Ligand binder design. Sequence first.
Ligand SMILES: CC(=O)SCCNC(=O)CCNC(=O)[C@H](O)C(C)(C)COP(=O)(O)OP(=O)(O)OC[C@H]1O[C@@H](n2cnc3c(N)ncnc32)[C@H](O)[C@@H]1OP(=O)(O)O
Length: 211
Amino acid sequence: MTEEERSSALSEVSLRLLCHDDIDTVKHLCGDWFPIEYPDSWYRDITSNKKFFSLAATYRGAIVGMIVAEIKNRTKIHKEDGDILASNFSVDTQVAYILSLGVVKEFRKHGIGSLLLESLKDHISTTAQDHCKAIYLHVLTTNNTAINFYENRDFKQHHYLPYYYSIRGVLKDGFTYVLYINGGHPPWTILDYIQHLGSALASLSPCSIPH
Ligand SMILES: CC(=O)SCCNC(=O)CCNC(=O)[C@H](O)C(C)(C)COP(=O)(O)OP(=O)(O)OC[C@H]1O[C@@H](n2cnc3c(N)ncnc32)[C@H](O)[C@@H]1OP(=O)(O)O
């Protein structure tokens, strides 16, 4: 391996947004990555609609991983996950949904998935720090590799969703995972919250509190 070969290697991996020309490649990869099936509309939307943050990692120009997400108003969360954020956050409050994350199997366990997730966080910080208060996604309950990846990155299991998915026509369970950011938190009734509060304030010395 020449020094010239070493220098070249440094520009080989890069990141870019998806485009419409990507659709056929993205379909092939997704067919490998996920045992579920996405409709044609999904591929067209993720590649072409600017509302999505669709980010590819490439090696020698070829896509080797992607993360696809949507930053959207809290009201757009689907009903099964409607309880992710407290409803007294501002009407302008947003969340980020991860539609998809995948890395070609050959390239796994080199940090690509991690960098894609980090890039989405960086994009949120750049674009929507004022309003985005959670990141959420779904996995198959059987997907230990994904579960571990998310749990080790501080996402927490939020809901159990029975028969959420179809693999070759056979229904399979899912989980919702959530990471709160920028002060996001789940809904509480006031009465429940005040009960919880006693544990939170316990650390305060009685002497420090006016009485
Ligand atoms: C909407 C959804 O989220 S769908 C669910 C996610 N997608 C899938 O399950 C599709 C199939 N699976 C995949 O595509 C991959 O397995 C992914 C996306 C889950 C992870 O992608 P990867 O590129 O392998 O992730 P990454 O390399 O960052 O980290 C994975 C493991 O590799 C290890 N790792 C990280 N960096 C390195 C490294 N530099 N060298 C060796 N190992 C590393 C860590 O042990 C990490 O382990 P952990 O998961 O226990 O924390």
